[PDB]
Structure 1
Amino acid sequence: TLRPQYFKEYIGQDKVKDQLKIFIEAAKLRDEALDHTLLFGPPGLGKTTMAFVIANEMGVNLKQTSGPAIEKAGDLVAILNDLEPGDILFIDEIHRMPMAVEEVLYSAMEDYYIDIMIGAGETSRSVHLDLPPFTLVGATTRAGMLSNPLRARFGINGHMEYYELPDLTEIVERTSEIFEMTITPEAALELARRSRGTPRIANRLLKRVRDYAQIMGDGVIDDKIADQALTMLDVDHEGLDYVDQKILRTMIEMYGGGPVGLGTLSVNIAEERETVEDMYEPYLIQKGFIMRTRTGRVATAKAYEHMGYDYT
């Protein structure tokens, strides 16, 4: 299937994957529940996929929900106490839970009980509701939004990193086997180098090249077809989009490389300041084409040799 199911199939993330293997194997030897795990990092790196792999390796059934669907203490109190011994509870977007609900987890995670008011009027009473052993798993992109007392209770932490070209090539070839398409190893590398390091983008490029090859070609992804399709999409061999190329060119041909301010540059390309700072500048900086300084943006030597100008 499109999502891997076992560590055999999960490519990359060697640091995270190695740690989880050791902790999961030790937990089985003691015959006890796995500690609480928190998975966090950039978008599209495999956080949701890993949570399903953990449940398969432990050999237990997974219960799933999300932070937005939970809104009041009665909701979580009803989800809890439905757990059987050894269940795994996975909450996606755990950062959306209201802070009044987060504080109910403080007792549940540390001591496996929650205080509940039961009865009404004179019959109202406070009694311990005692939970069976279980493992909570959360996934989030905004870990800094969780309360400090909660993050302190997670016993395992996983920070997801970007993938390298060798691993991305193997993912493209794997996906090219679910779809019934022949792909040459040259084209598999030609795509991976443009995927910005993210598996979700690699899958998106493959689907777009497929549509072209089966309409404008013979339905085979060869080197000749791939170059034509990537020219239609106008994606450079470094993953720079059409607008990205225009930004670097405007900086070198009008300001001689800078320094130039964000406002002045945006107006010259007819783009609003927000789209430039949020969609395009972040990748150019991480790859070293632009440098931010107190006086403005500056084009680096690497940008000159990429666009073909002279670094005078």
Structure 2
Amino acid sequence: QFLRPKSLDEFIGQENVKKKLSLALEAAKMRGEVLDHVLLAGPPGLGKTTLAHIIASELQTNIHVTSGPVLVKQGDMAAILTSLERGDVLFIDEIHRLNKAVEELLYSAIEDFQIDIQPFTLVGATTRSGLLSSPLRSRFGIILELDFYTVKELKEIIKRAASLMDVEIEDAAAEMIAKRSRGTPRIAIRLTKRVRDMLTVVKADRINTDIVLKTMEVLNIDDEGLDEFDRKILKTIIEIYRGGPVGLNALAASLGVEADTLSEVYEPYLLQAGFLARTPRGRIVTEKAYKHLKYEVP
């Protein structure tokens, strides 16, 4: 947790999100008012959880962490709501996974602020804002959509991480890791830790391009940052479905994984990076995919 930003000033990137959040945060603090409800949406590892904690820290209130699938019976939701103190942040990750039972209960605590519930700030996190119910989504006065980070931003996050792990790194090497981080801070930091391991075993004074390449080879990460499963998705569409189009459920069944893990975790960067495309009839692979994986373009 020593690598987790403790404030917006330590949060690299997401300029648009930061200015919007900072505005609402500073104003609330100055007026001593409870912050309006906030919804954080975007792929995993982009900092949603980090922002939820920063919000509570700046308001100088307590944060209550929970998950949608964890809150099944109304009893679990009631207990949490009644433990909230004025101004507290109720952070619900995977909020779109709330069942109608606890959902309707949470919905009520937002309007009438009674189940007697102390005014609080609801901070929800989801991979896609479109997953939340129409009713609940209209309750958030602040919606922050996080998109993938730029290579420059990731490079900065990597250099910051290395410094915190007591390891030197050359700019060129940091650039190389960032280019292979699939636009995600979580991925970039994990790769940096693994490259640190290589530097340790090879007894180097600082992380260079050579050390990075050696590590990428051990981790099976290619020049585009794609890992084994990313390649598996693309290769399955290419070989089994002749390039597509193939439906999400069909592709998921062939891969032996939940459709959610596919469309919420892996597909986002593949679409953003131009390896995959979505059509009404299903997912399709692009020419860039065939060329990158060295497949004869049909």
- After TM superposition, the score normalised by the length of structure 1 is 0.76
Alpha-carbon distance change, 109 to 275 in structure 1, aligned in 2, over 3 angstroms: same
Partner in structure 2 of residue 206 of structure 1: 192
How far apart in 1 are the matches of 2:106 and 2:236? 53
Partner in structure 1 of residue 21 of structure 2: 20
Aligned pair count reads 287
Q: Which moved more, 1:19-28 or 1:95-104?
A: 95-104
Q: Which moved more, 1:193-202 or 1:208-217?
A: 208-217
Deviation of 1:158 after TM superposition, in Å, equals: 1.3
- CA offsets per residue over residues 106-146 of structure 1, 9 Å max, x none? 332112222xxxxxxxxxxxxxxx33322111212254443
What SS does the aligned partner of 2:10 have?
coil
Q: Which moved more, 1:161-170 or 1:68-77?
A: 68-77
Are 2:20 and 1:39 equivalent residues in the alignment?
A: no
Partner in structure 2 of residue 189 of structure 1: 175
- CA offsets per residue over residues 236-268 of structure 1, 9 Å max, x none? 32224468779989999x9xxx767769xxxxx
Partner in structure 1 of residue 120 of structure 2: 134
How far apart in 2 are the matches of 1:39 and 1:295? 28
| Equivalent position to 1:216, from 198, 202, 205 | 202
- Aligned ranges for residues 1-312 of structure 1 at < 5 Å? 1-114=2-115, 130-141=116-127, 143-218=129-204, 220-241=206-227, 273-274=254-255, 278=262, 283-289=269-275, 300=287, 302=288
- CA offsets per residue over residues 193-247 of structure 1, 9 Å max, x none? 1111111111121122122221133353123322333334343322244687799
Deviation of 1:42 after TM superposition, in Å, equals: 1.0
Alpha-carbon distance change, 259 to 246 in structure 1, aligned in 2, over 3 angstroms: closer
One-letter amino acid of the counterpart of residue 112, structure 1: F
- CA offsets per residue over residues 61-119 of structure 1, 9 Å max, x none? 222333333222233223223333222222223233321221122332112222xxxxx
Over the residues paired in the alignment, what is the CA RMSD in angstroms?
3.7
What SS does the aligned partner of 2:9 have?
coil
Identity of aligned residues (%): 52
Unaligned runs of 5+ in 1: 115-129, 264-271
How far apart in 2 are the matches of 1:213 and 1:135? 44
Q: Which moved more, 1:181-190 or 1:215-224?
A: 215-224
- Which has the greater radius of gyration? 1
- After TM superposition, the score normalised by the length of structure 2 is 0.80
How far apart in 2 are the matches of 1:259 and 1:184? 40
